[PDB]
Amino acid sequence: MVNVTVAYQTSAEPAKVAQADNTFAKESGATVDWRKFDSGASIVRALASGDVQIGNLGSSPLAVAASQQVPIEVFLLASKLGNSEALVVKKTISKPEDLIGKRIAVPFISTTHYSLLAALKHWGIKPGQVEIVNLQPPAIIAAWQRGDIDGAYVWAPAVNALEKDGKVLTDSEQVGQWGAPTLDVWVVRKDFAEKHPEVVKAFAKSAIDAQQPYIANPDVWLKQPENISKLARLSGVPEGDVPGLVKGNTYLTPQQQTAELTGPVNKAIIDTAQFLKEQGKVPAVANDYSQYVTSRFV
Ligand SMILES: NC(=O)CNCCS(=O)(=O)O
Numbered sequence: 001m002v003n004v005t006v007a008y009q010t011s012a013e014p015a016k017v018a019q020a021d022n023t024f025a026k027e028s029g030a031t032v033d034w035r036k037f038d039s040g041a042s043i044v045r046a047l048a049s050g051d052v053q054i055g056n057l058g059s060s061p062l063a064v065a066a067s068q069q070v071p072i073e074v075f076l077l078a079s080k081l082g083n084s085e086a087l088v089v090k091k092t093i094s095k096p097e098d099l100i101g102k103r104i105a106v107p108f109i110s111t112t113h114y115s116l117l118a119a120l121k122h123w124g125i126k127p128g129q130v131e132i133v134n135l136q137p138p139a140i141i142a143a144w145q146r147g148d149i150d151g152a153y154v155w156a157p158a159v160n161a162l163e164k165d166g167k168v169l170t171d172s173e174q175v176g177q178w179g180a181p182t183l184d185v186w187v188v189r190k191d192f193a194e195k196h197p198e199v200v201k202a203f204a205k206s207a208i209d210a211q212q213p214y215i216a217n218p219d220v221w222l223k224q225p226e227n228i229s230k231l232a233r234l235s236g237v238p239e240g241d242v243p244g245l246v247k248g249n250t251y252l253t254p255q256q257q258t259a260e261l262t263g264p265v266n267k268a269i270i271d272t273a274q275f276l277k278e279q280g281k282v283p284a285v286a287n288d289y290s291q292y293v294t295s296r297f298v
Contacts, residue, residue: 002030002196006203007043007055010036010137011184012156012235012245013079014221018210020230028202038136039107047072053192054203058111059183063272066292067282071190074265075297076204077252078184083171084248085112085182087119088162089151093169096123099130102150105143108134109281111182112153114272115172117279118180119153127279156245157236173248180275183268184249188297197297204297211251218247254298261295269293 008019018024025032035052037043040061046052048070056078057065065072093099099120106113113134120127135143137158143149144162151169152162172182186207193200214221221227222243231246232239252260269289276282 002028002199003033004030004054004192004196004199005033005035005052007035007037007046007052008234009040009043009056009184010038010156010235011079011084011249012231012237012242013184013211013249014214014227014231014246014251015078015207015210016231016234017227018206020234023206023210024203027206028199030196030199030202038138039110041108041110044070047187047189050189050191053189054200055187057185057187058114059185059268059272060109060111060114060276062185062187062292063269063276063285063289064109064282065187066269066289067273067276067285072187072292073190073193074185074261074293075188075193075200076186076207077257077260077265078186078207079249079251080176081111081182081184082173082176082248082250083168084159084245085115085153085155086159086163086171087112087116087151087153087169088159088166089169091165091167093150093167096125096169099125099151099169101129101131103131103133103148105133105135105140105149105152106154107136107140109276111172111184112155114276115175115180115182116153118178118275119170119175122175122178156241160237160241160245171248181268182272183265185265193297200297208252208254208257208298212253214246215251215253222246257298258295261293261298265293266290
């Protein structure tokens with residue numbers, strides 16, 4: 001018997017169809033505990049303690065984990081993040097200069113904490129000029145509803161909840177264009193990969209297979225009602241928000257997976273870690289993270 005705990009997150013993306021269909025468990029034969037995490041920092045800790053064996057991490061929590069020598073490897077990309085992650089603010093905040101003195105929430109060292117710091121740097125605003133507070137996305141929604149924060153840089157379901165009444169000031173497609181792109185990845189603990197390599201391959205296969213029908217023709221994929229309802233259920237968003245969210249990233253073919261895992265992801269971690277060091281969020285970094293990426297499961 002193989003038991004595996006998988007830490008998943010709430011982005012609405014096509015591989016959620018494979019999760020809702022239980023395809024990984026069916027094809028691998030493992031008993032799979034899918035555990036929902038509110039952001040990536042807590043996933044890094046659960047991977048480090050051995051409580052989780054496969055986890056979905058943003059590129060910023062990934063660089064923190066790799067700088068702390070957590071024994072995990074990226075074995076699959078989930079998505080290249082675009083405007084599915086966004087800074088949503090009170091409507092009276094009209095320009096980036098209006099963020100000065102405001103209370104802006106982000107989950108600690110998430111991709112949106114990272115993107116917020118990169119956006120402030122791009123705008124010429126020191127992070128000390130903004131009251132950046134650390135809250136998990138459910139608490140962000142609650143604080144926003146009570147008017148205790150002025151905005152947040154968030155992903156689904158918080159991003160669409162806040163946008164119902166707020167205004168988008170920037171998003172991670174823009175921040176990517178400015179030179180700080182962010183990614184979502186899947187990582188695996190080494191000891192699990194050593195013992196159950198065919199289960200890890202089955203995970204990658206299930207996720208990659210599920211994204212290819214979307215890549216081939218987004219509009220045809222999005223008009224299959226069961227695709228929309230499965231993502232709405234697992235992300236916790238209204239069905240009407242799913243197409244805009246799914247189109248807010250790009251996804252990879254199998255050829256693109258192998259290409260990105262053979263160099264570009266390493267370079268992504270190096271650059272992400274460097275910026276986090278400059279921003280004071282990690283004490284030490286490395287000039288190479290090839291121990292933390294592999295193409296051998298795709
Ligand atoms: N993976 C997701 O669904 C949200 N994007 C990354 C969040 S974090 O950086 O891991 O906190």
